[PDB]
Amino acid sequence: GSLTEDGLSYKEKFVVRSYEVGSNKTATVETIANLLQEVGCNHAQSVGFSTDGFATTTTMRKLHLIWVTARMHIEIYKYPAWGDVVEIETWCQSEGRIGTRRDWILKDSVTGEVTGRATSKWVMMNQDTRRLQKVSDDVRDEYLVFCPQEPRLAFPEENNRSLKKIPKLEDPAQYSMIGLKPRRADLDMNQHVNNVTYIGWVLESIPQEIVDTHELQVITLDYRRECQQDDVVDSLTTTTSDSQFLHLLRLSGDGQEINRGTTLWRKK
Amino acid sequence: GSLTEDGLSYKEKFVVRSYEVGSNKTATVETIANLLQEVGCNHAQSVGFSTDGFATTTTMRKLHLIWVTARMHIEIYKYPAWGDVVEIETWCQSEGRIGTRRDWILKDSVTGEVTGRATSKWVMMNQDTRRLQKVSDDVRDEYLVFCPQEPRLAFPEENNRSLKKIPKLEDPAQYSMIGLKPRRADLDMNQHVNNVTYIGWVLESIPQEIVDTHELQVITLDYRRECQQDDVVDSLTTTTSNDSQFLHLLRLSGDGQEINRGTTLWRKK
Ligand SMILES: N#CCc1ccc(O)cc1
Numbered sequence: 124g125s126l127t128e129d130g131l132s133y134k135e136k137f138v139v140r141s142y143e144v145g146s147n148k149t150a151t152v153e154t155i156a157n158l159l160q161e162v163g164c165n166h167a168q169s170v171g172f173s174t175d176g177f178a179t180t181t182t183m184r185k186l187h188l189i190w191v192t193a194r195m196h197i198e199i200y201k202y203p204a205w206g207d208v209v210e211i212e213t214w215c216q217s218e219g220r221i222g223t224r225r226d227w228i229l230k231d232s233v234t235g236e237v238t239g240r241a242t243s244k245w246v247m248m249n250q251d252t253r254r255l256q257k258v259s260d261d262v263r264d265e266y267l268v269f270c271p272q273e274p275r276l277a278f279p280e281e282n283n284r285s286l287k288k289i290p291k292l293e294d295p296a297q298y299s300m301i302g303l304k305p306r307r308a309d310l311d312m313n314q315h316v317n318n319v320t321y322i323g324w325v326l327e328s329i330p331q332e333i334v335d336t337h338e339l340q341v342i343t344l345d346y347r348r349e350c351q352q353d354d355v356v357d358s359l360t361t362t363t364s365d366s367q368f369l370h371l372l373r374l375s376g377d378g379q380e381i382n383r384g385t386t387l388w389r390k391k
Numbered sequence: 392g393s394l395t396e397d398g399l400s401y402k403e404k405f406v407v408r409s410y411e412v413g414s415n416k417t418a419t420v421e422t423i424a425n426l427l428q429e430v431g432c433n434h435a436q437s438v439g440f441s442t443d444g445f446a447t448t449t450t451m452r453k454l455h456l457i458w459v460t461a462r463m464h465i466e467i468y469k470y471p472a473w474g475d476v477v478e479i480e481t482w483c484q485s486e487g488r489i490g491t492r493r494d495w496i497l498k499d500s501v502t503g504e505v506t507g508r509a510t511s512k513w514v515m516m517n518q519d520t521r522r523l524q525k526v527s528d529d530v531r532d533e534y535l536v537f538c539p540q541e542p543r544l545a546f547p548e549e550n551n552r553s554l555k556k557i558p559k560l561e562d563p564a565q566y567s568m569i570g571l572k573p574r575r576a577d578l579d580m581n582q583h584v585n586n587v588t589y590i591g592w593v594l595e596s597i598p599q600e601i602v603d604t605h606e607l608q609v610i611t612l613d614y615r616r617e618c619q620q621d622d623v624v625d626s627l628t629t630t631t632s633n634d635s636q637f638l639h640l641l642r643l644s645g646d647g648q649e650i651n652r653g654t655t656l657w658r659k660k
Pocket residue numbers: 159160161163164177225318
C-alpha cells in the first residue's frame with residue numbers, strides 16, 4: 124500500500140482469500156468492510172498518526188478524544204471472487220464542525236473498472252464519558268493538511284442514498300434473529316466490538332431464501348450505541364418494498380437501540 | 392505465494408492486518424489458523440487441484456469422497472504483531488491407509504526464525520452419507536507425486552503432544568460458555584461451519600483473567616462431528632494443572648452430543 128503522488132489519498136491491493144468468500148464464491152460484504160477498515164488504518168499510519176489511537180491528532184490525545192463511526196454506507200456493483208485482486212483508494216475530508224468523512228473507491232485491479240464505493244461519517248467523542256461533540260477549530264486545523272481542499276466525493280449525487288434519514292422499525296418485525304452475542308474474534312485490540320460485526324448481525328435476520336436468490340447492492344447503517352462484550356442483541360428486519368429492507372439492532376432485554384439500517388438487494 | 396524448487400511444498404507471506412489482532416496487538420490463534428487454511432488451499436491449487444473440491448483427486452470426485460479434518464495441533468512461540476510479515480511453508484504426506492497429514496512451519500520473514508508450527512490429520516469421508524473410510528491404493532497413488540517420499544515432520548520429537556489421546560471432560564465443568572451459534576460469517580463457500588470457528592468456541596469458555604495474564608502456547612483439537620448452521624453449542628473447560636493446562640469439550644446445547652474435544656497449554660506473560 125502507498126499514498127498517491129499528492130499525498131492526499133492512499134491505495135492498497137488485496138488478493139481475496141478462500142475463507143473470505145461466501146456461497147457464491149465471492150467476497151462477503153463483511154470481508155469488504157474489513158478491507159475498508161484496513162486501508163483506512165494504513166492511510167492514518169502513512170501520514171504520521173501513532174498506532175496507540177486511530178487518526179488521533181496531538182490535541183485529541185490531550186483532550187481524551189477519539190473518532191467514532193456515526194454512519195457507514197456501502198454500494199457494491201460486483202463482488203470480487205476468490206483469487207481476484209481488488210484495489211482500494213481511500214481519503215478523508217473535513218465537514219465543517221459536524222465531523223469528518225472517509226470515502227473509498229473499489230476497483231478490479233486487472234481492468235481498472237470501479238466495482239464498488241463507500242462513504243462514512245465520523246464524530247468526535249470523549250473516550251471516558253462517551254460524550255459527543257462538535258469538532259474544535261484547533262483540532263480541525265491540525266488534520267486539514269492531510270485532506271484534499273476541494274470536495275472529492277465517492278457519492279457526488281446531491282441528496283442521495285448515503286445522506287437519507289432512517290426510520291425506526293415498528294414492532295412486530297417481519298423477521299428476527301435473537302440472542303446474538305459477540306465472541307473474542309468479534310473484538311478489536313482495545314476489547315471493543317468491531318464495527319463490521321454489527322453489519323453481520325443486521326444481515327442475520329434476512330431470510331436465507333433472499334440471500335440465495337439475491338445479491339446485496341446497498342447497505343446504510345447508523346451507529347447509535349455500542350454493544351458491550353457482555354451484551355446480547357436482537358436483529359430485526361421488515362421488507363419495505365429489487366428488494367428493500369428496514370433493519371433494527373437492539374439490546375435483548377430492555378430493547379435499547381444499538382443500530383438502525385436499510386439494505387437494497389438485486390435479483391441474481 | 393509459490394511452490395518451492397522441488398515442487399514438494401508451498402510458501403506464502405502475509406502482512407498481519409489491524410482487525411486480525413487481539414488485546415496484545417498480536418495476531419489471534421484464529422487469525423493464524425485462517426492463514427494456515429489459506430496457504431493449504433493455495434498449495435492445492437498450485438499443484439493442479441480444481442477449486443470445486445479441496446485436494447480431491449480424480450477418483451475421489453467419481454466416488455463422492457472428500458478430506459475432512461480429524462485433528463488440528465498448533466504450537467506458537469511468538470505471535471506476529473500488526474504490520475509484521477509472517478512466512479508460512481506447508482506440505483502433505485500420506486499416512487498409509489489411515490489418511491493424510493498436512494504440516495506447517497511459521498517464520499518471521501525478516502529474521503528467518505521459526506515462530507510456530509502446526510500439524511493436522513485428515514480422513515476420507517463420503518460427502519453424502521458422511522461415512523469415514525480408509526484410503527484406497529488408487530487414491531493414495533494419485534496424490535503421492537505431490538508429497539515428499541522421505542518423512543518430513545513439523546513435530547518430529549519421539550515424545551510430543553500432537554499424537555496423544557484426549558479424555559472426555561466430566562460434568563460438572565469448571566467453566567462454561569453456553570448457547571454459542573454460528574452466523575453467516577462463520578460459514579465457508581459450501582455453507583458449512585469453518586473449522587476455525589470451533590477453535591474460537593473452545594476458547595470462549597477460558598476465563599478472561601487467564602487470557603489477560605497468559606499467552607496460548609499449544610492447542611490440540613479433535614473434530615468428532617459437525618455443527619450445522621442451525622445448531623447451538625455449549626463450550627466447557629476444566630483446569631487440569633507457571634503454565635496452565637485445560638481440558639475442553641464442545642457439545643450440542645440440547646442432547647449434549649459431542650462435536651469436539653481438546654486441550655490447551657498457556658504460559659504466563
Ligand atoms: N476506516 C477505518 C479504520 C478504522 C475503523 C474502525 C476503528 O475502530 C479504527 C480504525
